[PDB]
């Protein structure tokens, strides 16, 4: 079967499952383990690594930095800037600091982490300057709903936006009503974060559901793998699960090979139905 890829920035076809790093860089005795988890993912064909300045207050970025040493040409590196750093007075410095901790001279992609009080115009000019200087190849956003994206498109050069990173998983389908359709209409890939719902922390009976467990068992796959396949069932969606466990990384990479039937998806629609209303943008 055809490989599941996404056009992402300057990269024409990245694999549709990448590597999250939230809660890496926190525990300094787990450094080497985290490096190996990232390295196993790259080994198994995943290229997109997603981090941020927020994550363990620079720690995640440092871990990713050691992990990608000698492998910069193998990875598609995405980081992010706090809304309060996303204007003239702090953009260059926050990027410079991310880059230093990553031990690299460029990002493939830089995302506004979420929307704050800096006018979008200012943020876009700041990003375009980083592009011009070669610090980032492309820029994008995170945690923007349909209305924020429309506001971004009304901004000069705001259509250069490369992705929108938003929460999406089986038990939180809100983006399906209006956001994913808008994104498809403008050829904008979505990065899906918490694609496993934090291994069921964000939904009490998700991982423990009866039908789900049996649907996984019949395929010989795990629940997490079933939920990943679900996220990337349609094109233009790049899931970024986090896995500091090698066993989990390898499984996540194998989720790329899973094509769920029309029967199975309708059953999942009965258990976790799509939205019938403009729902507010879910975030963690």
Ligand X SMILES: NC(=O)C1=CN([C@@H]2O[C@H](COP(=O)(O)OP(=O)(O)OC[C@H]3O[C@@H](n4cnc5c(N)ncnc54)[C@H](OP(=O)(O)O)[C@@H]3O)[C@@H](O)[C@H]2O)C=CC1
Structure tokens at 67: 């992990």
* Full DSSP string of 111-142: EE-S--SS-HHHHHHHHHHHHHHTSBS-EEEE
Q: Which of 23, 55, 168, 193 is catalytic?
A: 55
CA distances 39 to 45, 65, 137, 235, Å, are 10, 12, 23, 26
Separation CA 284–CA 272 (nearest Å): 19
CB-wise, 15 or 241, nearer to ligand X? 241
The site map against ligand X for 243-262 (x = CB under 6 A) is xxx--x--xx----------
Using CB under 6 A, which residues numbered 50 to 69 contact ligand X?
50
Parallel, antiparallel, or unpaired for β 109-112 and 19-20? unpaired
Residue 113 annotated as lining a ligand binding site: yes
Size of the site for ligand X (CB under 6 A): 27
The site map against ligand X for 77-116 (x = CB under 6 A) is ------------------------------------x---
Is 284 one of the binding residues for ligand X (CB under 6 A)? Answer: yes
The CB-of-92 to ligand X minimum distance in angstroms stands at 21
Applying CB under 6 A, the span of 7-15, 117-125, 188-196, 265-273 interacting with ligand X comes to 188-196
The CB-of-132 to ligand X minimum distance in angstroms stands at 25
Is 163 one of the binding residues for ligand X (CB under 6 A)? Answer: no
CB-wise, 137 or 248, nearer to ligand X? 248
> Are 183 and 164 in contact, with CB atoms under 8 Å apart?
yes
Separation CA 81–CA 17 (nearest Å): 22
Separation CA 160–CA 155 (nearest Å): 10
Is 209 one of the binding residues for ligand X (CB under 6 A)? Answer: no
Is 21 one of the binding residues for ligand X (CB under 6 A)? Answer: yes
Per-residue DSSP letter, 36: H
Concerning whether 55 is annotated as a catalytic residue, the answer is: yes
Separation CA 189–CA 179 (nearest Å): 11
> Are 270 and 171 in contact, with CB atoms under 8 Å apart?
no
Q: Please give the annotated binding residues, written as ranges.
A: 113
Q: What residues are labeled active site?
A: 55
Q: Please give the annotated binding residues for substrate, written as ranges.
A: 113
Residues of this chain that bind ligand X (CB under 6 A):
20-22, 50, 113, 142-143, 165, 193-199, 222, 224, 240-245, 248, 251-252, 284
């Amino acid at each position: 079967m055809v490989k599941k890829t996404v056009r992402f920035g300057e990269q024409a076809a990245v694999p549709a499952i990448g590597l999250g790093t939230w809660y890496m860089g926190e525990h300094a005795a787990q450094r080497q383990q985290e490096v190996a988890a990232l390295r196993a993912g790259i080994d198994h064909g995943l290229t997109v690594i997603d981090t941020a300045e927020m994550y363990a207050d620079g720690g995640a970025e440092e871990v990713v930095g050691q992990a990608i040493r000698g492998l910069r040409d193998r990875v598609v590196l995405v980081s992010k800037v706090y809304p309060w750093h996303a204007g003239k007075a702090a953009m260059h410095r926050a990027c410079e600091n991310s880059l230093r901790r990553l031990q690299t001279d460029y990002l493939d992609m830089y995302l506004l982490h979420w929307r704050g009080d800096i006018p979008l115009q200012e943020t876009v000019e700041a990003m375009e300057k980083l592009v011009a200087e070669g610090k980032i190849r492309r820029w994008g956003v995170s945690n923007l709903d349909t209305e924020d994206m429309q506001a971004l498109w009304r901004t000069a050069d705001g259509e250069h936006c490369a992705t929108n990173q938003v929460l999406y998983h089986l038990a939180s389908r809100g983006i399906e009503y209006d956001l994913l359709p808008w994104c498809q209409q403008h050829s904008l890939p979505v990065m899906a974060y918490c694609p496993l719902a934090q291994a069921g922390r964000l939904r009490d009976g998700l991982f423990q559901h009866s039908d789900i467990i049996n649907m996984a068992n019949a395929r010989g796959i795990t629940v997490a793998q079933l939920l990943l396949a679900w996220v990337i069932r349609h094109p233009g969606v790049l899931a970024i699960p986090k896995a500091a466990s090698i066993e989990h990384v390898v499984q996540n990479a194998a989720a790329l090979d899973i094509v769920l039937s029309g029967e199975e998806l309708a059953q999942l629609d009965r258990l976790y139905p799509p939205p019938q209303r403009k729902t507010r943008l879910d975030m963690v």
